[PDB]
Write an enzyme that holds these catalytic residues in place. Structure first.
Site, PDB file in Angstrom:
ATOM      1  N   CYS B 107     -18.263  34.784  43.735  1.00 39.19           N
ATOM      2  CA  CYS B 107     -19.642  34.460  44.141  1.00 39.19           C
ATOM      3  C   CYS B 107     -20.708  35.233  43.357  1.00 39.19           C
ATOM      4  O   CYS B 107     -20.795  36.440  43.459  1.00 39.19           O
ATOM      5  CB  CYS B 107     -19.866  34.655  45.655  1.00 39.19           C
ATOM      6  SG  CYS B 107     -21.571  34.193  46.144  1.00 39.19           S
ATOM      7  N   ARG B 110     -24.207  37.204  45.388  1.00 38.10           N
ATOM      8  CA  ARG B 110     -23.975  38.206  46.425  1.00 38.10           C
ATOM      9  C   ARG B 110     -25.095  39.220  46.676  1.00 38.10           C
ATOM     10  O   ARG B 110     -25.035  39.941  47.650  1.00 38.10           O
ATOM     11  CB  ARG B 110     -22.635  38.918  46.216  1.00 38.10           C
ATOM     12  CG  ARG B 110     -21.432  38.050  46.605  1.00 38.10           C
ATOM     13  CD  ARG B 110     -20.173  38.841  46.370  1.00 38.10           C
ATOM     14  NE  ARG B 110     -19.737  38.733  44.979  1.00 38.10           N
ATOM     15  CZ  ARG B 110     -18.809  39.494  44.421  1.00 38.10           C
ATOM     16  NH1 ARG B 110     -18.229  40.430  45.137  1.00 38.10           N
ATOM     17  NH2 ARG B 110     -18.448  39.302  43.151  1.00 38.10           N
ATOM     18  N   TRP B 279     -27.869  28.340  48.599  1.00 35.21           N
ATOM     19  CA  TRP B 279     -28.582  27.388  47.775  1.00 35.21           C
ATOM     20  C   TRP B 279     -27.877  27.315  46.422  1.00 35.21           C
ATOM     21  O   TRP B 279     -27.096  28.182  46.088  1.00 35.21           O
ATOM     22  CB  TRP B 279     -30.072  27.750  47.622  1.00 35.21           C
ATOM     23  CG  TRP B 279     -30.337  29.150  47.126  1.00 35.21           C
ATOM     24  CD1 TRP B 279     -30.268  29.596  45.829  1.00 35.21           C
ATOM     25  CD2 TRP B 279     -30.740  30.277  47.916  1.00 35.21           C
ATOM     26  NE1 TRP B 279     -30.587  30.935  45.773  1.00 35.21           N
ATOM     27  CE2 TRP B 279     -30.871  31.378  47.038  1.00 35.21           C
ATOM     28  CE3 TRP B 279     -30.975  30.468  49.288  1.00 35.21           C
ATOM     29  CZ2 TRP B 279     -31.266  32.656  47.484  1.00 35.21           C
ATOM     30  CZ3 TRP B 279     -31.354  31.736  49.736  1.00 35.21           C
ATOM     31  CH2 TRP B 279     -31.509  32.808  48.832  1.00 35.21           C
ATOM     32  N   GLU B 284     -24.234  24.409  38.609  1.00 34.56           N
ATOM     33  CA  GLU B 284     -23.265  23.729  39.474  1.00 34.56           C
ATOM     34  C   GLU B 284     -23.520  22.225  39.462  1.00 34.56           C
ATOM     35  O   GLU B 284     -22.581  21.431  39.365  1.00 34.56           O
ATOM     36  CB  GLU B 284     -23.366  24.254  40.906  1.00 34.56           C
ATOM     37  CG  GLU B 284     -23.081  25.756  41.035  1.00 34.56           C
ATOM     38  CD  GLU B 284     -23.245  26.231  42.459  1.00 34.56           C
ATOM     39  OE1 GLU B 284     -22.307  26.013  43.251  1.00 34.56           O
ATOM     40  OE2 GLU B 284     -24.298  26.813  42.787  1.00 34.56           O
TER      41      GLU B 284
HETATM   42  C1  HEM Z   1     -27.502  32.348  48.541  1.00 35.34           C
HETATM   43  C2  HEM Z   1     -27.248  31.500  47.527  1.00 35.34           C
HETATM   44  C3  HEM Z   1     -25.873  31.445  46.808  1.00 35.34           C
HETATM   45  C4  HEM Z   1     -25.670  31.187  45.510  1.00 35.34           C
HETATM   46  C5  HEM Z   1     -26.783  30.908  44.462  1.00 35.34           C
HETATM   47  C6  HEM Z   1     -24.248  31.204  45.249  1.00 35.34           C
HETATM   48  C7  HEM Z   1     -23.604  30.993  44.036  1.00 35.34           C
HETATM   49  C8  HEM Z   1     -22.255  30.699  43.906  1.00 35.34           C
HETATM   50  C9  HEM Z   1     -21.595  30.032  42.807  1.00 35.34           C
HETATM   51  C10 HEM Z   1     -22.282  29.458  41.526  1.00 35.34           C
HETATM   52  C11 HEM Z   1     -20.294  29.968  43.095  1.00 35.34           C
HETATM   53  C12 HEM Z   1     -19.203  29.315  42.223  1.00 35.34           C
HETATM   54  C13 HEM Z   1     -19.205  27.851  42.685  1.00 35.34           C
HETATM   55  C14 HEM Z   1     -18.333  26.895  41.894  1.00 35.34           C
HETATM   56  O1  HEM Z   1     -18.280  26.983  40.627  1.00 35.34           O
HETATM   57  O2  HEM Z   1     -17.700  26.022  42.565  1.00 35.34           O
HETATM   58  C15 HEM Z   1     -20.076  30.592  44.386  1.00 35.34           C
HETATM   59  C16 HEM Z   1     -18.863  30.762  45.017  1.00 35.34           C
HETATM   60  C17 HEM Z   1     -18.611  31.254  46.286  1.00 35.34           C
HETATM   61  N1  HEM Z   1     -19.552  31.764  47.181  1.00 35.34           N
HETATM   62 FE1  HEM Z   1     -21.598  31.751  46.757  1.00 35.34          FE
HETATM   63  N2  HEM Z   1     -23.613  31.557  46.420  1.00 35.34           N
HETATM   64  C18 HEM Z   1     -24.573  31.648  47.414  1.00 35.34           C
HETATM   65  C19 HEM Z   1     -24.346  31.923  48.756  1.00 35.34           C
HETATM   66  C20 HEM Z   1     -23.130  32.119  49.387  1.00 35.34           C
HETATM   67  C21 HEM Z   1     -22.915  32.286  50.819  1.00 35.34           C
HETATM   68  C22 HEM Z   1     -24.024  32.214  51.888  1.00 35.34           C
HETATM   69  C23 HEM Z   1     -21.605  32.497  51.017  1.00 35.34           C
HETATM   70  C24 HEM Z   1     -20.854  32.727  52.352  1.00 35.34           C
HETATM   71  C25 HEM Z   1     -21.500  33.251  53.399  1.00 35.34           C
HETATM   72  C26 HEM Z   1     -20.958  32.459  49.724  1.00 35.34           C
HETATM   73  C27 HEM Z   1     -19.613  32.648  49.475  1.00 35.34           C
HETATM   74  C28 HEM Z   1     -18.947  32.137  48.387  1.00 35.34           C
HETATM   75  C29 HEM Z   1     -17.512  31.954  48.287  1.00 35.34           C
HETATM   76  C30 HEM Z   1     -16.414  32.277  49.335  1.00 35.34           C
HETATM   77  C31 HEM Z   1     -17.296  31.381  46.886  1.00 35.34           C
HETATM   78  C32 HEM Z   1     -15.935  30.983  46.277  1.00 35.34           C
HETATM   79  C33 HEM Z   1     -15.618  29.601  46.830  1.00 35.34           C
HETATM   80  C34 HEM Z   1     -14.356  29.041  46.224  1.00 35.34           C
HETATM   81  O3  HEM Z   1     -13.473  29.814  45.746  1.00 35.34           O
HETATM   82  O4  HEM Z   1     -14.258  27.785  46.245  1.00 35.34           O
HETATM   83  N3  HEM Z   1     -21.920  32.270  48.760  1.00 35.34           N
HETATM   84  N4  HEM Z   1     -21.289  31.065  44.823  1.00 35.34           N
HETATM   85  C1  LIG Z   2     -22.164  28.651  49.551  1.00 36.84           C
HETATM   86  C2  LIG Z   2     -22.286  28.100  48.154  1.00 36.84           C
HETATM   87  C3  LIG Z   2     -23.482  28.216  47.450  1.00 36.84           C
HETATM   88  C4  LIG Z   2     -23.542  27.668  46.161  1.00 36.84           C
HETATM   89  N1  LIG Z   2     -24.657  27.736  45.406  1.00 36.84           N
HETATM   90  N2  LIG Z   2     -22.477  27.062  45.615  1.00 36.84           N
HETATM   91  C5  LIG Z   2     -21.311  26.940  46.265  1.00 36.84           C
HETATM   92  C6  LIG Z   2     -20.187  26.231  45.535  1.00 36.84           C
HETATM   93  C7  LIG Z   2     -19.201  25.574  46.478  1.00 36.84           C
HETATM   94  C8  LIG Z   2     -18.134  24.829  45.721  1.00 36.84           C
HETATM   95  C9  LIG Z   2     -18.400  23.550  45.233  1.00 36.84           C
HETATM   96  N3  LIG Z   2     -17.473  22.842  44.566  1.00 36.84           N
HETATM   97  C10 LIG Z   2     -16.254  23.341  44.350  1.00 36.84           C
HETATM   98  C11 LIG Z   2     -15.928  24.615  44.822  1.00 36.84           C
HETATM   99  C12 LIG Z   2     -14.548  25.154  44.556  1.00 36.84           C
HETATM  100  C13 LIG Z   2     -13.591  24.446  45.503  1.00 36.84           C
HETATM  101  C14 LIG Z   2     -12.231  25.068  45.338  1.00 36.84           C
HETATM  102  C15 LIG Z   2     -11.163  24.266  44.980  1.00 36.84           C
HETATM  103  C16 LIG Z   2      -9.920  24.859  44.838  1.00 36.84           C
HETATM  104  C17 LIG Z   2      -8.768  23.971  44.456  1.00 36.84           C
HETATM  105  N4  LIG Z   2      -9.750  26.208  45.042  1.00 36.84           N
HETATM  106  C18 LIG Z   2     -10.791  27.018  45.392  1.00 36.84           C
HETATM  107  N5  LIG Z   2     -10.637  28.358  45.605  1.00 36.84           N
HETATM  108  C19 LIG Z   2     -12.046  26.439  45.540  1.00 36.84           C
HETATM  109  C20 LIG Z   2     -16.870  25.379  45.523  1.00 36.84           C
HETATM  110  C21 LIG Z   2     -21.193  27.464  47.561  1.00 36.84           C
END
Ligand code: HEM
Ligand SMILES: Cc1cc(N)nc(CCc2cncc(CCc3cc(C)nc(N)c3)c2)c1
Ligand code: HEM
Ligand SMILES: Cc1cc(N)nc(CCc2cncc(CCc3cc(C)nc(N)c3)c2)c1
Ligand SMILES: C[C@H](O)[C@H](O)[C@H]1CNc2nc(N)[nH]c(=O)c2N1
Ligand SMILES: C[C@H](O)[C@H](O)[C@H]1CNc2nc(N)[nH]c(=O)c2N1
Ligand SMILES: [Zn+2]
Lengths: 404, 403
Positions: B107, B110, B279, B284
């Site tokens: 993430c 953070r 957001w 993305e």
């Molecule tokens: C506040 C604005 C936020 C931004 C701009 C942001 C940004 C991102 C981005 C760009 C990713 C990678 C996404 C991808 O390539 O699929 C990500 C992953 C992730 N974020 Fe955030 N994030 C935000 C808020 C949050 C919040 C509120 C949470 C949980 C409370 C969170 C938890 C996670 C988790 C667990 C992942 C990994 C998900 C996965 O492995 O699929 N994030 N974040």
């Molecule tokens: C809270 C939040 C904020 C933000 N700006 N973006 C996101 C991205 C969410 C998101 C979107 N598409 C794809 C994924 C990854 C899905 C994914 C898929 C697999 C196979 N393994 C994983 N560990 C994760 C995550 C989440």
């Protein structure tokens, strides 16, 4: 099912298993507790086992595994180690090891070319002057007036109780970086230290942004000697942009030949401390890293100003736009000048082909994802969506500390 | 023992001491790094995770080793000893949820971790009730374009029974209709979930941007279908600041990125349904969602509109179209007054987060491949930053698809 890492491509949905990693005899920096994948820097019995392993690799590659010549060579190697503490490679063993070290290099995206390497054998070299002759020959051959050919020159191996052959420069072609009175740097900030070492050893320096450095070459137990490369040997490419006419007015340029000179080539426990190797550039190396890194030539702002972009806010994507044009200038200028170059799309497409070849040939391919994915347009290239397993195989190229 | 972590742009070095708090092994060994892989291949146990977490909580409120700390440790012990499980107090849940976000290595956002609205939905007993909670969450998080990070926590997993689950991978997702000719209309990533919705009774649209209904599942029941009221799902039509024809591509994206398929683990307890939202970072949408070959795959379409030379890789037509598509996302969100962050701003603020976490905790787990954005990698400061990856608890985890 299979007791080996599963490896997936997320674009195509296809799966393989890496069995090659089982061959790895050297530990990386990772543990189950923490991944250290992104870190840039990670006696007769020991040598003999490394030697036996190399010789086995050699006899497998020529399909004479278990044969009389194989067993006799094994016996020849241990008898030589038993009486001198070291041994020596046959000419064809060296050629094989050098290609294998390139093949094994996890950070190299250009490995589709691995079988196509000209190995210059320079293990007879005995002076710094002769290293210079050898190096000049390498550069002429490799450059080939712009039709670049992959090559490596191998100087004598490390010897017990004898000093090393070393090239002090990190590449055979580098630009000077001159520390300024105002703290800034004229030229390439990467090369500040080597520039100052050259001056200390009697080089009269220039005052340009693109002054080719001289070579500092060290023969065993001698101070390094300074050698100026004759300018007709160092092919350079003036940079222009295909449609933005002012770009040529910037006076940017780069050299044709990327030639690493500070890496150790290890083969069967033998260590070649001086074994400079060269290929041709991927365009992002010049256009993105060398010209746009903040700690390098750092030209992004200048170019964006010329492009009249809004440099006051991140969200205009001025940085991305200028970087694209610089990269396009690199490609167009090399193409115009007829110097071999490969763009980051074609290079990564070819690396995927190489992964497939190696899956069939050896059941895997060690690769360092962070280094393989280009520094612009990452996910636009096929390697971004390809999982990779990273591990150390020998023969290898290895970083070594600066000799000073 | 403690790894040295170097920034190669600035020459600065720190040492990660936080990694010693990891209790969960990742996929790497000394023989090989598997850091690029997307997925990973008892009473006393729960009790020790529970203790450690309660210790983390009392530590966070600077009441470590106090009476309340002592008596809370005893309550957890007493409850586990009698029932094989226990329950969190709301404030502990709030703490654990913020910590799981903080601890999430993939993430980049953070720096926002302390600003998280936590909805306690543990008193939910039906898919209907799950739906109302989810609608509250969406309305709250969207806040007319001024997005606010939020999480809703449904009832924990229990040994006796099936899980509360949201079948959808995000609360808001576009349908993908597999066509006669084997092509996909809409979003190829959502073919399977689309077909599942239809099979459970959804009348499908036929568009490229049809918002999917939710399949919500209460324990040991068939999932139920619920259509989100269109007024709740904020969307941004995509136009370009200078390229007037771009608006005619008819492109759009939803405001609210809300992950709904991950498991939240806190103190050994498992929350199988715990949707969270922040957001978007513009790459993305602009790079991955619209430009991936296995997603909307619009690159060539855009390049041709721009009249670029698509015949050869060396014109860098992909790189050029990709930049404009990202620009158009940023501009449109800005125009529509919906929160967005570009990849330069986000990574700069991530660097600040690293420094904050260094002083606060002695390190920060970070997955370099996911932190570095998918375009212009080395143009952002994170490219040149070494990172250490490890699993801290509380944590978000991947979980199997419930079907
Ligand atoms: C506040 C604005 C936020 C931004 C701009 C942001 C940004 C991102 C981005 C760009 C990713 C990678 C996404 C991808 O390539 O699929 C990500 C992953 C992730 N974020 Fe955030 N994030 C935000 C808020 C949050 C919040 C509120 C949470 C949980 C409370 C969170 C938890 C996670 C988790 C667990 C992942 C990994 C998900 C996965 O492995 O699929 N994030 N974040
Ligand atoms: C809270 C939040 C904020 C933000 N700006 N973006 C996101 C991205 C969410 C998101 C979107 N598409 C794809 C994924 C990854 C899905 C994914 C898929 C697999 C196979 N393994 C994983 N560990 C994760 C995550 C989440
Ligand atoms: C044929 C054209 C070649 C291309 C296009 C190419 C491409 C590249 C690139 C882009 C890198 C990363 C460099 C960086 O970002 O600093 C690299 C690394 C590397 N390559 Fe190649 N390569 C080529 C030939 C060669 C040859 C001939 C060898 C040696 C025989 C070689 C061995 C290596 C090694 C050892 C590294 C890692 C260097 C380090 O860690 O500093 N490559 N290659
Ligand atoms: C043969 C060859 C061909 C090519 N296209 N590129 C190269 C890359 C050369 C190159 C340029 N700049 C920097 C480096 C990295 C030097 C380097 C530095 C450190 C600290 N650790 C390492 N393992 C390596 C290598 C080599
Ligand atoms: C910190 C990180 O490991 C470092 O910046 C790496 C990332 N990937 C790279 N990839 C290549 N090809 N070359 C590099 O110098 C780097 N730098
Ligand atoms: C194979 C590779 O690890 C995979 O494509 C990852 C790379 N980096 C990523 N980074 C982010 N932020 N999101 C992703 O989906 C991915 N995909
Ligand atoms: Zn690793």
């Amino acid at each position: 099912g299979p007791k080996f890492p599963r490896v997936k491509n997320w674009e195509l949905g296809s799966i393989t298993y890496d069995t090659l990693c089982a061959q790895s005899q050297q530990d990386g920096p990772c543990t189950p507790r923490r991944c250290l994948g992104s870190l840039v820097l990670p006696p007769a019995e020991q040598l003999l086992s490394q030697a036996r392993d190399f010789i086995n690799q050699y006899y497998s590659s020529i399909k004479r595994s278990g044969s009389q010549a194989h067993e006799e060579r094994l016996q020849e190697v241990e008898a030589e180690v038993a009486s001198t503490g070291t041994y020596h490679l046959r000419e064809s063993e060296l050629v094989f090891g050098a290609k294998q070290a390139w093949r094994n290099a996890p950070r190299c995206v250009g490995r589709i070319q691995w079988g196509k390497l000209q190995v210059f054998d320079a293990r007879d070299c005995s002076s710094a002057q002769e290293m210079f002759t050898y190096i000049c020959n390498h550069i002429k051959y490799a450059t080939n007036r712009g039709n670049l050919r992959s090559a490596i020159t191998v100087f004598p191996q490390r010897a017990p109780g004898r000093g090393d052959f070393r090239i002090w420069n990190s590449q055979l072609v580098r630009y000077a970086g001159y520390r300024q009175q105002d703290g800034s740097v004229r030229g390439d900030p990467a090369n500040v230290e080597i520039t100052e070492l050259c001056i200390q050893h009697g080089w009269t320096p220039g005052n340009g942004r693109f002054d080719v450095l001289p070579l500092l070459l060290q023969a065993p137990d001698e101070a390094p000697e300074l050698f100026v490369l004759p300018p007709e040997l160092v092919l350079e490419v003036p940079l222009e942009h295909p449609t933005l006419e002012w770009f040529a007015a910037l006076g940017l340029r780069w050299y044709a030949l990327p030639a690493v000179s500070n890496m150790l080539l290890e083969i069967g426990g033998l260590e070649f401390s001086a074994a400079p190797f060269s290929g041709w550039y991927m365009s992002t190396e010049i256009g993105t890293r060398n010209l746009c890194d903040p700690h390098r030539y750092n030209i992004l702002e200048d170019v964006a100003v010329c492009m009249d972009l809004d440099t006051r806010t991140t969200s205009s994507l001025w940085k991305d736009k200028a970087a694209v044009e610089i990269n396009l200038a690199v490609l167009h200028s090399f193409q115009l000048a007829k110097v071999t170059i490969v763009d980051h799309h074609a290079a990564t497409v070819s690396f995927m082909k190489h992964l497939d070849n190696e899956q069939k040939a050896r059941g895997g391919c060690p690769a360092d994802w962070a280094w393989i994915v280009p520094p612009i347009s990452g996910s636009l290239t096929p390697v971004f969506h390809q999982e990779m397993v990273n591990y150390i195989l020998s023969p290898a190229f290895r970083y070594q500390p600066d000799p000073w």
